[PDB]
Structure formats: C-alpha cells, structure tokens
Ligand binder design. Structure first.
Ligand SMILES: Nc1ncnc2c1ncn2[C@@H]1O[C@H](COP(=O)(O)OP(=O)(O)O)[C@@H](O)[C@H]1O
Ligand SMILES: Nc1ncnc2c1ncn2[C@@H]1O[C@H](COP(=O)(O)OP(=O)(O)O)[C@@H](O)[C@H]1O
Lengths: 209, 209
C-alpha cells in the first residue's frame, strides 16, 4: 500500500528504445521479424524497428493470471496462432523484464509455433533483483524494484494506483484534495501526467466508482 | 521537386490518440478487441487502448506493393492467421487514412478471418481529398495532402527523404551542408528530429550508400 513509482517520459522512451537498438546493432544480430508482446511491447517494438530497419512486426497477446487460493502465477498467450517464420531471425520485444515469466513464455511459444532460425529477447528495462531470466538485450538495468509508469500506460496505471487508495477510504464521497495528498504520500507523485479529476471521471464512466 | 512534409511530435501523437479515443467514448462503441495494422497502427493502438480501457490488442502486418509496369497498387496481409473473435466488437486502428486501401483490406480481412460481431475503423488522421474510404473515427481531418513524419518513424522517413535527394546528386559526393540545404529546400525542415549525419552513418551501415 506504499509503492515506489517512476514516471517515464516519451523522451526517456525514445532514449531507451534507441539505446536498446544500438546494442543489437553492435552485436550484429540481423533481425528479420520482430515479435512484440502485447500490450507492453507494442510501442518499444515500433521504435526499435524504426532504428534497426525492420519492416515485419507481429504480436502475441500475453495475459497474466493469478490463482486466488495458491497465489500461483501463470502467463498465457491469448488468441494463439501459428505462422511460418523459418529462415527468419526473430527478435522478441517487451517493455520491461521484471519476473521474466512473459519473455520465458514468449520465447518458448515463438519457437514451437513460429519455428524461426533464431530467437533473441529484448526489453527496455531489466530489474536485476527480480528477473528469473535475463533478456538477450536490455537498455537499462534496474537494481531496485519499482513500478514504471510508461507514457502509453498513464491512464490505466493511475486508475489502479488511485483505486488502491480508494479501497481503504473514509468512503463513498471523494475529496479530490485528500486523494492528491494520498497520491503524493503513497507514490511520490505531486503532478500525475493525467490530472486526478480526469482519472476519477474516467473511473466513473468505467463504473469502478 | 518538393514534398510537403510535416513533423509530428509525441505530444501531438498523444493529443490525437486521445481525441480519437474521445470520439469513440462519445459514440458509446464498446470495444472488446483492437486490431492494429502493423506497423503504422501499433503505437496509436496502444494509446487508444490506454484511454478506452481495452486489454486485447492483436495486429496484422499489411504490405504495400506496386507493380512496376502498370503502376498497379496492391495491399496485402503478410503472415496471415485466423483467430476466433465472435461475440467480440473489433476496433481496427491505423495511423492515417490516406488512400484507404489498407483499412479497406483490413476490414475485409478481419471480417472474413476473425468473424467479429462488429468492426469499426479508426485512424489518427484522415486526408479528405485522397481517401477513397472514410474511417468510422478519426482525430484530425487533413484537407491538403502532405507526408506526416511520425515520432516512431523518424529514422526510416529521413533515410528515404535523404535518399530521394542523393539519387540526383550532380557528382559522386555527399557534402553534409549541401544535403542540409537541400532538405530545407525540398521539405521545409531546418532541424530534422534525427540529425542528418546520424542518418548518413546509418544509411552506410544499411548499405544504401
Ligand atoms: N515494475 C514494472 N513496471 C511496469 N510494468 C510492469 C512491471 N512489472 C510488470 N509490468 C507489466 O507486466 C507485464 C508482465 O510482467 P512480467 O511477466 O514480469 O514480464 P517479463 O516477462 O517481461 O519480466 C510487463 O509486460 C509489464 O507491462
Ligand atoms: N501522408 C502520409 N503520411 C504518413 N504516412 C503515410 C502517408 N500515406 C501513407 N502512409 C503510410 O502508408 C501506410 C499505407 O497507406 P494507405 O494504404 O493509404 O493507408 P490507409 O488505408 O490507412 O489510407 C499507412 O499506414 C502509413 O503508415
């Protein structure tokens, strides 16, 4: 209920995606197809593709489930398909390597269903202490876990962060100022990229409040 | 000869994606799945998804071919697959509606192979004079054709724009300053987002010069 949060800007996204692409250039891995993990990897994938000169980008949606009693986590490809990717070199891309569960599944899935010559994985960020698996490439190493708010995720992240606060509330009527206070106290954010009243209005429409 | 080029910033991308999402909210179209047209629609798709609250994003790669003698254009899905999307409402997303050839194909493809309850199309921008088809939703109407440099496309676009200049060199050469003045002369860009020497270095590595 008190969470380290880092707001990531577009400029940083560009800077990261570019640095990630540089490593891949320098390693001279010739990428024929990029497989983006949706939704997190879509944006980083397009950027890396721009820098490297990759024209074929495909994507697979990975869901993240938890079993209520056991707290067992299971990553799972939603809407699975197969394509013939032989004689092609695949680069899989995601936003961040946190646990490594998703890039583990993706590599495995891609190798069984797409049948590429080679597969390498790449994420913008990589959390050393938390990652069971290390991606072939990453732009930035994180030695201390935090939640990273990406510029393409601001709405959803803020909705969740706000909700964590509202489910412990004096209740029902929402003082925007108390909320703003709590957001600073809990996450360290004085100035959310999306203003909190816009967030609240949206949570209402999505009837979460 | 001159090409009208407009450089589009991330802030504008955000502003557009958001406005596009607002239209869709206001029309009360309940989107279950977003199908992004790769590569152009990937980024806009992630953003619209953030704003609307859509969790499932799939993508199909559309290629664009021209036959050399007839100048006949043909859009074509590369790496086709099928998934069962029945009882779902699909939103297809691309960056811009220029000719309409790609969103025409995507709509037709998605309805034949995915079998959704309903399909609607949406792009950030829409060029009135050029579009044979009009997307269900768009953020911005363009009444005068130009080429839009998107922030996820800066490298590739500049590589091409530079190459259009280099293939009419007077001599085997490449004075960076000549290039810079030609770029202003031809496209109206004094300050390309990626500096032109970086572009040249990259064209060399890609064996284009
Ligand atoms: N610390 C974090 N900051 C931002 N997003 C995260 C973080 N941890 C997980 N996520 C989101 O959850 C998804 C799955 O996480 P995980 O299964 O650990 O991925 P990976 O296999 O890349 O480590 C990521 O693609 C990302 O969108
Ligand atoms: N004026 C333009 N500015 C930027 N990109 C363009 C333009 N026209 C075409 N493109 C690129 O070419 C792709 C295909 O164009 P087109 O077949 O006309 O698409 P649509 O079916 O969306 O009109 C687009 O997704 C876009 O990436």
């Amino acid at each position: 209920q008190k969470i380290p949060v880092k707001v990531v800007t577009w400029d940083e996204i560009v800077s990261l995606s570019t640095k990630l692409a540089e490593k891949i250039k320098a390693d001279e891995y010739n990428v024929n197809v990029i497989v983006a993990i949706a939704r997190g990897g879509l944006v980083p994938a397009r950027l890396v593709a721009d820098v490297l000169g990759v024209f074929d980008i495909l994507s697979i949606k990975i869901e993240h489930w938890i079993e209520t009693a056991s707290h067992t986590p299971e990553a799972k490809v939603k809407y699975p398909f197969k394509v013939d990717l032989s004689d092609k070199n695949v680069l899989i891309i995601d936003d961040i390597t946190d646990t490594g569960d998703s890039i583990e599944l993706a590599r495995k899935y891609v190798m069984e269903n797409f049948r590429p010559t080679e597969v390498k994985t790449a994420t913008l960020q990589y959390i050393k202490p938390a990652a069971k698996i290390i991606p072939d490439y990453y732009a930035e190493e994180i030695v201390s876990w935090a939640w990273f708010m990406y510029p393409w995720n601001y709405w959803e992240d803020e909705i969740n962060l706000v909700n964590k606060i509202l489910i412990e509330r004096k209740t029902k009527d929402i003082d925007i100022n108390e909320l703003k206070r709590n957001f600073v106290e809990s996450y360290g954010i004085e100035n959310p990229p999306i203003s909190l009243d816009k967030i609240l209005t949206e949570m209402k429409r999505r009837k979460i409040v």
